[PDB]
Structures are given as C-alpha cells and as structure tokens.
Amino acid sequence: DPFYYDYETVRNGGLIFAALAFIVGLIIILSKRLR
Amino acid sequence: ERDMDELKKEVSMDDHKLSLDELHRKYGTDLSRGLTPARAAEILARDGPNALTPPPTTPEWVKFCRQLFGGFSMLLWIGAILCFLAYGIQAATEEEPQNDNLYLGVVLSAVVIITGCFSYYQEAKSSKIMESFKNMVPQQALVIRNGEKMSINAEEVVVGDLVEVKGGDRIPADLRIISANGCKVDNSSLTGESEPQTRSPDFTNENPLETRNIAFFSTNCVEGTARGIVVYTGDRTVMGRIATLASGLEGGQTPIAAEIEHFIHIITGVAVFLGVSFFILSLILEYTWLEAVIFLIGIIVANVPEGLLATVTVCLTLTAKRMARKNCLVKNLEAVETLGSTSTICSDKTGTLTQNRMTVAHMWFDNQIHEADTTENQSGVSFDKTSATWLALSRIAGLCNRAVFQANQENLPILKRAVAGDASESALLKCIELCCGSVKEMRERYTKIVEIPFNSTNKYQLSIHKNPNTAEPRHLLVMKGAPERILDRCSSILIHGKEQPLDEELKDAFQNAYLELGGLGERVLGFCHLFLPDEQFPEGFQFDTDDVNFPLDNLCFVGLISMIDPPRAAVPDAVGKCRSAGIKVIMVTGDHPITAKAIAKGVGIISEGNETVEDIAARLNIPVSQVNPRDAKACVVHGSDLKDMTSEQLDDILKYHTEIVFARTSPQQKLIIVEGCQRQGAIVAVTGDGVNDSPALKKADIGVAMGIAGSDVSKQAADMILLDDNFASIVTGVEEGRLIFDNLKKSIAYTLTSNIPEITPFLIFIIANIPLPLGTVTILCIDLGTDMVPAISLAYEQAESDIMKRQPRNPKTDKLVNERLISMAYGQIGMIQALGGFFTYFVILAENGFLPIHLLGLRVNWDDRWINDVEDSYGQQWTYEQRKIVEFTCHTAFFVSIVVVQWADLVICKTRRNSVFQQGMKNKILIFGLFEETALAAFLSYCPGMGVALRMYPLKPTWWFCAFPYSLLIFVYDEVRKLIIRRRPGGWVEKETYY
Amino acid sequence: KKFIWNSEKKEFLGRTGGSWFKILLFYVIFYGCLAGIFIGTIQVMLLTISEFKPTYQDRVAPPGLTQIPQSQKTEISFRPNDPQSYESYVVSIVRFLEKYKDLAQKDDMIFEDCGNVPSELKERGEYNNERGERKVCRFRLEWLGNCSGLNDETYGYKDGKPCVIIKLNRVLGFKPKPPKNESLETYPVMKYNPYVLPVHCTGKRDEDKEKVGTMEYFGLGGYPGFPLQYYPYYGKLLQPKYLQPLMAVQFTNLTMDTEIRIECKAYGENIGYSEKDRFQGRFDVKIEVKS
Ligand SMILES: *[C@@H]1O[C@H](CO)[C@@H](O[C@@H]2O[C@H](CO)[C@@H](O[C@@H]3O[C@H](CO[C@H]4O[C@H](CO[C@H]5O[C@H](CO)[C@@H](O)[C@H](O)[C@@H]5O)[C@@H](O)[C@H](O)[C@@H]4O)[C@@H](O)[C@H](O[C@H]4O[C@H](CO)[C@@H](O)[C@H](O)[C@@H]4O)[C@@H]3O)[C@H](O)[C@H]2NC(C)=O)[C@H](O)[C@H]1NC(C)=O
Ligand SMILES: *[C@@H]1O[C@H](CO)[C@@H](O[C@@H]2O[C@H](CO)[C@@H](O[C@@H]3O[C@H](CO[C@H]4O[C@H](CO)[C@@H](O)[C@H](O)[C@@H]4O)[C@@H](O)[C@H](O[C@H]4O[C@H](CO)[C@@H](O)[C@H](O)[C@@H]4O)[C@@H]3O)[C@H](O)[C@H]2NC(C)=O)[C@H](O)[C@H]1NC(C)=O
Ligand SMILES: CCCCCCCC/C=C\CCCCCCCC(=O)OC[C@H](COP(=O)(O)OCC[N+](C)(C)C)OC(=O)CCCCCCC/C=C\CCCCCCCC
Ligand SMILES: CCCCCCCCCCCCCCCCCC(=O)OC[C@H](COP(=O)([O-])OCC[N+](C)(C)C)OC(=O)CCCCCCCCCCCCCCCCC
Ligand SMILES: CCCCCCCCCCCCCCCCCC(=O)OC[C@H](COP(=O)([O-])OCC[N+](C)(C)C)OC(=O)CCCCCCCCCCCCCCCCC
Ligand SMILES: CCCCCCCCCCCCCCCCCC(=O)OC[C@H](COP(=O)([O-])OCC[N+](C)(C)C)OC(=O)CCCCCCCCCCCCCCCCC
Ligand SMILES: CC(C)CCC[C@@H](C)[C@H]1CC[C@H]2[C@@H]3CC=C4C[C@@H](O)CC[C@]4(C)[C@H]3CC[C@]12C
C-alpha cells in the first residue's frame, strides 16, 4: 500500500527523545555535582 | 500628616519621677547587674518580641488567584468563555456537531492554568528571597544581663532590661536613664529639631519629652554613653505608636521598572492596535466570529512580551542575592541598579581601605629614629630601654593613653590580645607592654587628676598627673596629638635627659623625620609633657578642666611615634579595576597630607608619573606657587585649605584632576566634597562609619555604611552596607550592578526576537493569501509554554571579561529598550527566524503535493469548508479536513522551526560583546531550558491524541532538520558581528547594532 | 517637533542623513542576501521532489467522495416552480460537465476510446516522460441517463427530480478495488461488477430513509459506480486533460417541501471513512424541493 506511512515508528521515536530530553533536563536542573 | 506635636503631646504617662529605689522595686531589675537570662526569656514569652505589629500579608490563595485572573490572563479567560459559548450554540444547532471549539476552549483553559501557576511560582520565589534580606544582618542591642554585657537581637529586648548605648547607638525601646556620662540624644524624629539634647539621670522636668532621664524609641544618641532601663516595648513605645500608623513609606518608583513599564505600554498599544486591525480584516475576509477573537488573542500574545516584568524581578532579586553573597547588602532595591552607574567613589583610608590594625613600628626621639616592637622574642628594642628621653616618651605614651586591657588576657602574648580603646591607643598599649613593662602600675603611680579626651576643637588629648617623685614640682602635664600641632605647642626638647630650647635646627630635623616616616605609610603622633613650677602651682592646686588655667603652650616635646596600618589585600586590585573601568576614586581621610599621600600612592590611587604641584616643584626646585596648576593630574588637598575654599575652586580641583586625595579633612566636610562631585555630573558612592557622616551619606547617590565598625546612624542613613568594610567589595558591587543591566538587555533582546517570526505568518497569509502557516494555538504554546523558561534563563548569565573595561552608564542617555535593540531583534534576528519557519512550511506543503508557487491565492478555497476538491500542483483532489491536517502539521513544523531558531538565538544572546567560545555555556539554567523546550515541543508533537486536542500532529523526521541552516546562520552572523565590534570598537557595527 | 526634525546635523526623525543612507544600504544588502539564501534553499529543496509524483501521499488516503454541484453547507434546496432558485445548481453542474462534451474529446492522440463496459484498469506503465503524454479514456455524456445536459438541461431540477452527479477524488497512482463477492453481506444490494467501484445513496435517519423516494443510478454501462478502467491517475504533467469517472443519482418521488439528508457511500478495499471528515469515502447532502 504505497499510501500508508508508518506514523507509529516516528511517534515512538519522538516520544523516546522527549522522555530522554526531559530526564536530561531534570538531571541538569537537579544536578548534584554539575557545578 | 498632622502626627507631630499633636498626637504626641497628649499620650504621655511615664515614671521618670521614680527614684532609683522606686524604679528597682517597680520593674524588679538588678540596677547593677540586670535581669537574668531566664527572667529575660520569661518576659519575652509573656510580652512578645520587641517589634512592631507587621501589616497583613495576603494569603497564598490570593496571589495565586490574582495571577490566574491577571490582566493579560483575562484575555485568555474571555477567549475560553467565548469558545465554550460557541460550543453551546453549536450544540443546540445541527445534530452530531464537532468538538473543535470545545477542545479549543479547554486548551485556552490549560494555557491559563499553566501560565498562572508559573507566574505565581516565580513571584513567590522572588518574594521569599526578598524577605530573606530583612533577616540578613538585623540590628543588635547592647544589654546587661546576669552581670555581663551582651549584644542580643533587638526583638529580644523586654521591658526592664538594663540597656547601654553610646555615640552612634540606635535606641531599641523607650528607656529611663539610670547612669549617664555626657550623653546627648537627637530628637529630630521626635520633636522636629535636629539639635541634640542632653540625657541625664537627674530629674529636671516632669514632662516626658522635656525630662533628661528618658530615652525614646527610634532616636539615636549623638554623643556620650549611658545606661537605661526599658520602660515600654514593642507597639507600646513612644515613637512606636506614631511609626505604626503615620510613618509608612510612599510609592517608591524604580527606574529600571519604569523604563520597562514605558516600553510595556508602547508594545501593548502597538500589539492591541495590530490585533484589532487584523480582527476587522479577518471579519472582512469572511471568517467565523470566534476565529476573529482567536486571531486577535494570538496576535496580542505573540507581540506582547508579557514576561518582561517577571524577568526584571528575577534579575533584580538574583543580583541582589549576588551582592549579599559578596559583602554588598543593598538596603533598598533601587540601589541595586545604581551600583552599575557608579562613577565616583569617595572612600576613607583608615577603616575601609586599610584593616585598621595599627602596630607601633617607628619612633623618633633624641634627634634620632629608632625601630621598636621586637618580634616578641623578648629582645626588647633595637635601642637602649634606659634612654633618658625614651623614659619620658613611654611615660606620656602610657599615661596620656585612654585604652585598657580586658580581663582573661594574662595568658597570651601582647601582640595577640584584645584591648578597649582607640586603635592607635591599642598599638601604644601593646608597645609599652612589650618593651617597657606594666602599664597598669605606671598609670597608678602618676594618678590622673583631669583628662581631656580627643576633641576636634582642640585637636589633641590631654591629661594631668601627680608625680609621686621628689625631684619634680608635683605636676606632670602630658598630651599627644598632631605632630605638627604638638610641635607648635612646645619651647624645649629633651635630648638624652638634658632639656634644651626648641630651636629651628631641631624643627628642621623634626620636619625631615616627619616626612621620612610619612613616606613609609605610617601615621605619626606627637607627644609632649611639662613639669609645671611648684611655686605657682602647689601640690594641692586644683586644675580646672572646663576653665583652662594651667599653661597650654611652652611645653616640652619628647618624641614622635608612628604605627603601621597595612591596606587590605584586594585594595590594590580593586583600585586597578576602578581605573580600568573609568571610575574616579577619591580618598577622604583625616591623616596628615604626607602620610595620606604615601598610602594613596602605595595602594594605587596615585599611579606612576602623576605628580602633584608640590612634587613637580620639588623635582624642579621651584616654588610651588610658581608651578603650573594644570601640570598636576593628582593632588593632596588639606582640610584647612578646603575650609577657605569656594564652590568655584572646588569645581576646579574636582574638574581638572584625575587622582585627588583630601587629607586632614574632617568627616563633617565630606558633604561638601560629595556635593562638588555631584556638581561635576557624577554618580557617587561615599563610605561612612561615624555619626557626622550622616549628611554626606544621605546626599550621596550610594551611601556605603561600614558594617563592622559603622554605627547604627550610618547604617540607617546609608543605601548599602559593606559586610566586611573592604573597599574591593564596593568595586565588586559596581560590577554586579552593571551585570544586572547586561542581563536585562540580553533577556529583553531574546524575548522580542521571537515576535517577528510569530507575527510574520499572519501578515504573509493576508498579503500572499496562502494557507495559514502558524496558528493561534501554536503561538500561545510557544510564548506561554516553551520560551517561558529560556527567557528567564538569561538572568543567571555571568559577566563577560569586558564588564569592568568599559565606561559607566548614565541613566539620562543609556536606556534598556533602545532603537538598536529593536533593529537587531525585529529586523535582523526575527527575519531569519521567520524565513526559517516559512522554509519549513514550504517544505512540508511541497512534499505533500502543493508546489510553493501554487499556494499563492489558495487560502480562499483552502479555508472553505465546502469546497472539498482543491486541486494540488500534481492534480490531486484534497478534502477540507485532509488539507487542514496538513495545515496543522505545517503549524507544528513552524513551531519546531521556532524552537530550533530559538536555540541559536538563546545561545548568541548569552553574550553581546564576547564570543560564545569565551563565555562558554556555564549557564546551567539556560541549558536546562534548551533541553526542556525541545522535550516539550517533541512531546506536544508526538503525544497520541494531540491531533484532536491541541490540533498538533506528528512531525516527520526529515522536517525537524529544515530550520537548522537558519539557526546556524544566526549563530555565525552574531559571532562575526561581535568579532567586528571587538576588532573595531566604536565602528559602524558597534554604533549601530550594539544594543 | 525636535524629534521630528532638526536642521543642526540634518537628522530626520532621530537619525542623520548619512546614517539614514548607511542603514538603507546595509539593510538592502542584508535583506537581499537573506532573500537570496531563502530562494536558494527553496530551489535546493525543490531539487528533491519529483515532477510526476509527490514525496508523500498518505495524507490523501483513502480518497474522498464529492458531489457536484458544489453547494454551501452541502444544501441543495430550491423551488421547482421558481425558474431561478435552481439556476446556481444547474450552472455549477454545467461548468463541470462542459469538460466532458463531445467537442473537447475530439483529438485522438489525447483522447482514446476505452471499454464501453467495466473492464480492467488502464495502467500506462511508469510515471516518467519516456512516453510523453498518454491517452485519455473518453467518457461520453450519454452514460448519464436523464441528467446529461444533452436532452434535459435542468437535470431534473425543473420537474422536482434533482440529479446530483457523484465524483471520486482524483489521486495519482491509486488502484481502486471493489469489495469481493465473498464478503458482500453488509453493504446494500447493488449490481455487482468486479470492474466497478460501487457507490450507494441511502437516507440518514429513519425519517430520511423513508422520505427519500426512488434512487436512480447512472454510470458507465448502468452499473451504480465508477468503472475500474479509468484508473490510475498520472497527474497534470503526464495526463494534462485526464477525465475522471463520474456517476449521477436521480431522486424521484421525494416528499415536496421537506429537507432530506442523503448519504452516498462508496465501498471497496482501499475505501475508508472518518468520523470528523464527513467527506472521506462518503458525503452527505441536504436537499429540499420546496415548490
Ligand atoms: C428518465 O429516463 C427514462 C428512461 O429509462 C424515461 O422513461 C420513460 O418514462 C415515460 C413516462 O413514465 C414512459 O412513458 C410511458 O409510456 C407508456 C407507453 O409507451 C409505449 O411506447 C414507447 C415508445 O414510444 C414512446 O417513446 C419515444 C421515446 O423513446 C417517444 O419519442 C415516442 O414518441 C413515444 O412517446 C415504448 O418505449 C414503451 O415501452 C411503451 O411500449 C404509457 O402507457 C405510460 O402511460 C402511463 O403512465 C402515465 C404516467 O405514469 C399515466 O398518466 C398514464 O395514464 C399511463 O398509466 C407512459 O406514458 C416511457 O415508457 C419511459 N421510457 C421511454 C423509453 O420513454 C423517463 O421519462 C425519464 N424521465 C424524465 C423526467 O423524462
Ligand atoms: C410519490 O409521489 C406521489 C405524488 O407526488 C404520491 O402520490 C400522491 O399524489 C397526490 C397528487 O395526485 C398527492 O396530493 C393529494 O393529497 C391529498 C391529501 O390527502 C391525503 O390523505 C388522504 C387521507 O384521507 C388520502 O386518502 C389521500 O390519498 C392523500 O394521501 C388528497 O386529498 C388528494 O386526493 C387525490 O388522490 C387520491 C389518490 O390517488 C384519489 O383517490 C383522489 O380522488 C384525488 O384525486 C391527493 O392525493 C398526495 O399527497 C400523494 N400522496 C403522498 C405524497 O403520500 C405518492 O404517495 C408518492 N410515493 C410514496 C411512496 O409516498
Ligand atoms: C504546571 C503543569 C505544567 C504542565 C505543562 C505540560 C502539559 C502537558 C499536556 C498533557 C500531558 C499528557 C496528557 C495525556 C495525553 C495522552 C492521553 C491518552 O492516552 O490519549 C489516548 C487517546 C489517543 O489515541 P489515538 O492516538 O489512537 O487517537 C487518535 C485520534 N485520531 C485517530 C482521530 C486522530 O486520546 C483520547 O482518547 C482523547 C485525547 C487525549 C489527548 C490529550 C492531550 C492533551 C489535551 C488537553 C491538555 C492541554 C494541555 C496544553 C499544554 C500545552 C503547554 C504548552
Ligand atoms: C497592510 C500591511 C500592514 C503591514 C504591517 C507590518 C508591521 C510590521 C511591524 C509589526 C510589529 C512592530 C512592533 C513595533 C514595536 C515598537 C516598540 C518600540 O517602542 O519601538 C521603539 C523603536 C525606537 O526605539 P526608542 O524609542 O527606544 O529609541 C529611539 C532612539 N532615537 C530617538 C535616537 C531614535 O522604534 C523604531 O526604531 C522604529 C521601528 C519602525 C518599524 C516600522 C515597521 C514598518 C513595517 C512596514 C511593512 C510594509 C509592508 C508592505 C506590504 C506590501 C504588500 C504589497
Ligand atoms: C536526538 C539527539 C538530540 C540532541 C539534542 C542536543 C541539544 C543540545 C543543547 C543545545 C544545542 C544547540 C546549541 C548548540 C550551541 C553550541 C555553542 C558553542 O559553540 O559552544 C562552544 C563552547 C566553547 O566553550 P569552551 O568552554 O569549550 O571553551 C573555553 C575556551 N577558553 C578557555 C579559551 C575561553 O563549548 C561548548 O558549549 C561545549 C559543547 C559544544 C557542543 C557543540 C554542538 C554542535 C557542534 C558543531 C555544530 C554542528 C555541526 C554539524 C555538522 C554536521 C555534519 C554532517
Ligand atoms: C575545513 C574546516 C571545516 C570546519 C568545520 C567546522 C569545525 C568546527 C568549527 C567551529 C567549532 C570550534 C570553534 C572554536 C572557536 C574558538 C574557540 C576558542 O576558545 O578560541 C578562544 C578565543 C578567545 O580567546 P581569549 O584569549 O579571548 O580567551 C582566553 C583568555 N584567557 C587566556 C585569559 C583565559 O576565541 C575567540 O576569540 C573566538 C572568535 C570566534 C570568531 C568566529 C567568527 C566566525 C563566526 C562563527 C565561526 C564558526 C563557528 C562554527 C560554525 C560551525 C558550522 C558547522
Ligand atoms: C548539536 C545540536 C544543534 C543538535 C540538535 C539536536 C537535533 C539534531 C535533535 C533534536 C530533536 C531530535 C528529533 C526528535 C524526534 C525525532 C522523531 C524520530 O522518529 C526521528 C528522529 C527525530 C526527528 C529527532 C532527530 C534529531 C533531533 C532533530
């Protein structure tokens, strides 16, 4: 079906990136040794 | 405000009539030892803290709700109300309607909730930090409890407590004078007259105000020292009843907030004007009645930087905390911005520039200079302790002294113990105790009959002692003071025991020795004595103190004594930074011109090459009056000369001189010097520690009060408090003051940059008639949800290396929001951001089937909900919702491109003068925001259901990288621009883009 | 007026003349380079897409069923007795039907006569320019029974028998596939031809389904639908004058002066629907013959 683009793959990739970036930002703001 | 002489002369009932016994049995207090700490705690817990009742504080659900329904928030609340009303209308119409308007209204509600909570959190943090300052260094009170005198918190003082105050002390509560020794209080805040009235235990008047045995709250003792008993505490105090309801502060305006308010009103007006214009245009373009308000709200939000006030509050509070952590306690929030504009610093030599830890180092007697103060190895001195003249020198150095050693000090050396008295007196005591013997016994044999403390009128000390010897005429007058003045008060000098008349040869040698010791950075003091004739003054003669009867002249000079007072460690570097930052520093001290000149030259006030008129004359062996006055860039002005000077001469000296040092200048004359500096158009910061400095501290733009040795009068009469009395702290404070301006301008530039790329799509959609590239939901999402943290992150940026390498800023010409700032944010950066957004939008539409050229004019049928056969560039037919999905996808792509360009803009906004490679990304909050905004955007674009809730659909990967060239372009452009400004200062780029 | 203009240094509105010329020149070169960079990136992006196929087509899938004449709110209400209340519908129908007359389909190189009965799809091969343009499956107006613009120009609107011609969304590279007879158990009874994508008009509610009347279907060979021999579409660059399959429906014996909402739904394998987009695969039309 050359009319169906897998949107779930991109959705999962973006959600994975969002979660990773949020965790990184959380670690940066709540850093224990990042002085 | 008729609260003076009318609301005071009526509420009056005291117990000044009570005698010592009646007072003791009434309050139940040990008149000689004070109440016990246990009893003090009991009275404290019974009556309450010694403080005034504070005003009511609004609860937590008051500020939160006021922010929720704030001014700007009202627009979104009304938008949600209109959306819910439209959904209600749509529910009554045609069956099976859609939830588009319902979801839009709920989205607006969520936006308002998030904005309100974030603003409430920021305001709460600012309020908490601001309140933390009132308890930084609270005012202390010296009370007497269980026999010992201790300094406790002012709020811990209760009625009946035995309190002791001195010159420069602030009265903690209404008191009854029990014992006093020449005490004079100032009732300017009580009766109106600034003239000081004496306070004495003797009952002289039945009226509470007129009596001499009652100390009132809020007033301060100008001269003397006394002990009293608290008669009323808290709100019951005399001045307390008046200061609680009639001394409230008025509406103090902060210029940093005023300039922002002005720009805020301008931007609000232009934004609302464009909003209503687009509103009427949208209605004319056959659009929904609700879509018009949607576009209006979006335009207003994207063009109004409604977070400017919050950013300003964050910058002010953060830098205020920075100053507090660097020994700069800002009494008021306005001074926080005046520090960066500082241009002249009138500091003192003893106390602030130096550590005031004097040490007797050199002496001069028997026409010779002698070193002393052995390194406590019991070596004594470098000369003989049996010198005849040295005996008279030690005698007058210890007998005329006024300082005494405290208890529990006979177990540690003399060069490391504490004293009670003048700093110079402390050095003299530690000297005689190290190389002569016991001062306690020396001061006992020569019993002191009468003593005259150091007075500005006499300019010398004085003391009469009875000698228990047999070869003396029972009288020994001893006095010290200014070497030049002490020398004019003598007729003879003691040389190895023999007294010989003071001829001109001896005076020449004394002058040479004076200049020699003065050039070394030591304060010299002259000492002399006299053995009055016995036939004229018998053993039992009564020397009157008030009525001088004994001879004051024709005495006998013994010798000179000089002490070492090293400057602070950071002082040379501080003055170096001051000169490197175009800040004129003036030293105001009361020492001799030679000593002050040497100290100023050593600390860096007077750099090499700069010579005064006297130095030039000495080098060319010509009279000083003949030398050219303009050839001297630096000078040392004498106090006596300053007294006979006019405003014109003052302006001439302060105008054509770059390094001025006013020596022998009394502290009261400081006000005139500050006035002269201000008259030259300069923002001055003046240091004060005594009570007479009050007029000068109040007149100066920034009064810096000494926090350690400074009295309460100076602290309450100043604008800033130096936590360590270190001069370098003032320079660090000025640096932080400039940093506030730098960060405020950077944040302003970053918040306004996003306005252009957010409003350009509406303008192009109306001019080019292309499908909407950026929607209202997207603009609201960006401004209130993603760039809310980065805009605040700029307040935490540190200072560049050129912060103290530029001229100071003048409030009359250098303002925050200038034309160049708009030209840079709206004309250069905003244009690149908008171009990147349009590029990504064109990429999406071109990839889905509509060529960029074909999109012109299609908005007419694109927005049509019934023409569901729009032919694309390839000839395909799209429906209404199908094409709208692509339009919303383009909106999300524009949102992503916006965040991408915001990354580069935020990075380049970290610095406006240096390169991003020099400052570095040491800003943790900034990087946190970079990560948070990207994460939030990704989540909003990929979270399931956003396509129908936020109308945001998943964004394909090959689109996320469409705006990267624009971000890198902004990065390289700003870097080369800053490189040009650095390599060519004052150039066209600097004079045109340096905001 | 001081800010407006000062003759001292020739400052106009705040800035001097030399400064005005300098900023004008700098802004011109800067904006020129910026717009040129934008155009360059535009062209570089365009060099990635093809001239005969879009890089993404999942957004147009499945195709949507549309009706002619295009009507506001999909409402086709008119007065048969009034000679002008249906002029808009007739004119909009003719505007689209004029492209299917015998005069336009004259040239034999551009127009080719395809099967008169539903046959297999006319696949031309690949989407390239090796063969230049391609023929167009001719579609005579006569395939529409009573609403063809050949005998009755009112299309039934004059006699209270409206004819709403149905149309399928033109999609490049789409191969419609009707549902197999094996699963023919949900959609209503209709003539089954494995080479025709079916379309059936029905009411919407128990009242609409009752007041509709008699449905009359007109299509190629009389089959209620679109012949498979008219697909796939090759775009405007390969088939500039391509003519898509059509089908009309006549609403006879409909209650006068009553609003009836009808829904024509197309069936097939690659034919889907949507709850929010009422035009993806089907369409609803409100008609009222108020005479
Ligand atoms: C939509 O298209 C359809 C085509 O499928 C059209 O259908 C026609 O409908 C009319 C009206 O209902 C029918 O007329 C009936 O004719 C019966 C007898 O006709 C016989 O002769 C016909 C041949 O001759 C006629 O046709 C040609 C055109 O083809 C004319 O040029 C010619 O001059 C003649 O007019 C045969 O084709 C037919 O099969 C018969 O053998 C009548 O008995 C009948 O009358 C009854 O119905 C009346 C109304 O209900 C009623 O009042 C009477 O009392 C009586 O009960 C009726 O008149 C056609 O048969 C039919 N087909 C054709 C081919 O014409 C339809 O008209 C069209 N819609 C519109 C709006 O035009
Ligand atoms: C398809 O469309 C046709 C016509 O459009 C419908 O048939 C009927 O057609 C007539 C016109 O000839 C319509 O008009 C008139 O309605 C009057 C209202 O009375 C109604 O109710 C009474 C109840 O007492 C019924 O008995 C009566 O039949 C009506 O339904 C009548 O008074 C008129 O009477 C004439 O017709 C009847 C029936 O042929 C004769 O017996 C009389 O002598 C007289 O000539 C006339 O009927 C009528 O409204 C139409 N009926 C409808 C719309 O229901 C078809 O019904 C319609 N098809 C379907 C399936 O509904
Ligand atoms: C101080 C606090 C700060 C907070 C700020 C951050 C705010 C974060 C916002 C939301 C957090 C997570 C919300 C949970 C969402 C997932 C819920 C879920 O499990 O959803 C399941 C289904 C989706 O299923 P599907 O994909 O198959 O459907 C597709 C439909 N088709 C096929 C027709 C297109 O959804 C459904 O049923 C119904 C749809 C539900 C979608 C909800 C999404 C949010 C909606 C309103 C919230 C508005 C918040 C705005 C915040 C912006 C800040 C800038
Ligand atoms: C119908 C088309 C309508 C197009 C409208 C386009 C509008 C573009 C601007 C949008 C938002 C602008 C917000 C400005 C906010 C300014 C706030 C402020 O205080 O600024 C002070 C600043 C000044 O700062 P200042 O006041 O602090 O400092 C002044 C310093 N001295 C005194 C030395 C000068 O304002 C300016 O510098 C002037 C800005 C002028 C901007 C002019 C934009 C013109 C737009 C033309 C578009 C034409 C389109 C034609 C299309 C044709 C199609 C066929
Ligand atoms: C799915 C993955 C998602 C990853 C998301 C990552 C988000 C990261 C946060 C922000 C990114 C966007 C802004 C980056 C800003 C970098 C600024 C900078 O110059 O820092 C210099 C600074 C310089 O400071 P310094 O401290 O190193 O140097 C000091 C030097 N003295 C002492 C002499 C003063 O260093 C850094 O910030 C360290 C990190 C640099 C990270 C650079 C990343 C980009 C690298 C090249 C550009 C892209 C090239 C792509 C090539 C592609 C080829 C096919
Ligand atoms: C064929 C080459 C291909 C190259 C591909 C890209 C490779 C990566 C390119 C840049 C990343 C590394 C940058 C290092 C910059 C200098 C860092 C530094 O610390 O020097 C200290 C010096 C500063 O030294 P300083 O002396 O001021 O600081 C130290 C002070 N003491 C000693 C007291 C501690 O840096 C600068 O002065 C920076 C000047 C930058 C001018 C830039 C002009 C052009 C604008 C952007 C340039 C390109 C940016 C990257 C673009 C990437 C695009 C993909
Ligand atoms: C050093 C700096 C400039 C790099 C900036 C990081 C960029 C490259 C990051 C930020 C967000 C990221 C995207 C986040 C989500 C997705 C969806 C996924 O299904 C494909 C990858 C894709 C599209 C990521 C590609 C990489 C990306 C665009």
Ligand SMILES: CC(C)CCC[C@@H](C)[C@H]1CC[C@H]2[C@@H]3CC=C4C[C@@H](O)CC[C@]4(C)[C@H]3CC[C@]12C
């Ligand atoms: C995309 C096109 C159509 C918009 C054209 C707008 C141009 C003519 C406008 C947009 C913003 C404007 C600038 C905005 C601010 C300033 C600062 C002021 O002190 C001098 C003029 C100057 C430098 C303006 C010059 C004219 C300008 C560049």
Ligand SMILES: CC(C)CCC[C@@H](C)[C@H]1CC[C@H]2[C@@H]3CC=C4C[C@@H](O)CC[C@]4(C)[C@H]3CC[C@]12C
């Ligand atoms: C040395 C510098 C100037 C090189 C600049 C390269 C430019 C021309 C390149 C860098 C990144 C590129 C973009 C990267 C990703 C996409 C998405 C794709 O679906 C269409 C092309 C598009 C939009 C590209 C267009 C060309 C582009 C902007």
Ligand SMILES: [Mg+2]
């Ligand atoms: Mg002083």
Ligand SMILES: [Mg+2]
């Ligand atoms: Mg002041």
Ligand SMILES: [Mg+2]
């Ligand atoms: Mg913004």
